[PDB]
Amino acid sequence: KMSQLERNIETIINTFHQYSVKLGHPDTLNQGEFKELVRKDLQNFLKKENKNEKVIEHIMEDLDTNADKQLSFEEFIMLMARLTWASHEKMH
């Protein structure tokens, strides 16, 4: 009964939750949680970026629009849209 799109969104949310709850505020990602999520769950889409810890750091800084050193889900979803676009583009 859950649609294809709804399942994909639930996958995103559950993956964010998996890491956000490890430490600190349970609904945001701190830097270490973000790094863990990217290294494991985006090991292909961010393969080049993962090779440099400082690049992963800059991506989180850029996403962290209220500059509180954590990523809310609202902040994080923008990465998801950007990566979906990037994947769409390279399947040309």
Q: Does the footprint of other proteins cover residue 19 (CB under 8 A)?
A: no
Q: Does the footprint of other proteins cover residue 42 (CB under 8 A)?
A: yes
> With contact defined as beta carbons under 8 Å apart, do 22 and 33 qualify?
yes
> With contact defined as beta carbons under 8 Å apart, do 23 and 33 qualify?
yes
CA 76 to chain centroid: 5
Q: Among 5-13, 17-25, 42-50, 53-61, which window interacts with Ca ion (CB under 5 A)?
A: 17-25
CA distances from 32 to 19, 28, 63 (A): 9, 11, 15
Structure tokens at 36: 């863990």
The Cα–Cα gap between 63 and 83 comes to: 13
Contact positions with Ca ion (CB under 5 A) in 26-85: 64, 66, 68, 70
Binding residues for Zn(2+): 17, 27, 88, 92
In the complex, the residues that contact other proteins under the rule CB under 8 A are 3-13, 15-17, 27, 40-45, 61-62, 64-67, 72-75, 77-78, 80-85, 87-88, 91
Binding residues: 17, 20, 23, 25, 27-28, 33, 64, 66, 68, 70, 75, 88, 92
